[PDB]
Amino acid sequence: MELFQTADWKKVKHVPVIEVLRAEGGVVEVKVSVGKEIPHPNTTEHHIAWIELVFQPEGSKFPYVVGRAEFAAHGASVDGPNTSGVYTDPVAVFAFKAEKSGKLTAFSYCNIHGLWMGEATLSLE
Ligand SMILES: [Fe+2]
């Protein structure tokens, strides 16, 4: 019944969550993660592959890619899937200089669950 709204935990599990760690004087650090509130698997069969961060300062006609983080290890070795002991967590910190406030957009990818997007505001206060 569409009278009753709800929330999908699977979306929460995949969405890239943006947290501004500092922004004083245009020295900015932004953390992006997937599966913060609700852990996302990291196995050889199922994992988050990367996160990319975009920033568009106000007054700027075009957006700029700030950077991209690949998460390369997911437990595979010559001994089989999930045996290597090495798993890269889908968390990244982007450090950058900025002269103005503006909009952040993050993108991420799961190898079986498609492409994902998230947004937040950067206030240089
Ligand atoms: Fe997934």
CATH code of the domain containing 32: 2.60.40.730
Give the H or E element holding residue 92.
strand 91-97
Q: What is the distance in A from the centroid of ligand 1 to the CA of 26?
A: 35
Tokens of 101: 């406030």
Task: Give the dihedral sign, CA 110/114/115/118.
Answer: negative
Resolution in A: 2.5
Q: Which residue range(s) make up the domain with 89?
A: 1-125
Q: 83: closest CA among 43, 40, 39, 41?
A: 43
Neighbours of ion ligand 1 (CB under 5 A): 110, 113
Q: What is the distance in A from the centroid of ligand 1 to the CA of 107?
A: 14
Experimental determination technique: X-ray
Q: What is the distance in A from the centroid of ligand 1 to the CA of 47?
A: 6
Give the whole-angstrom CA distance, residue 30 versus residue 106. 11
Burial of 99 (0-12, 13-18, 19+ CB in 10 A): exposed
Give the whole-angstrom CA distance, residue 116 versus residue 81. 26
Number of domains in the chain: 1
Q: What is the distance in A from the centroid of ligand 1 to the CA of 104?
A: 23
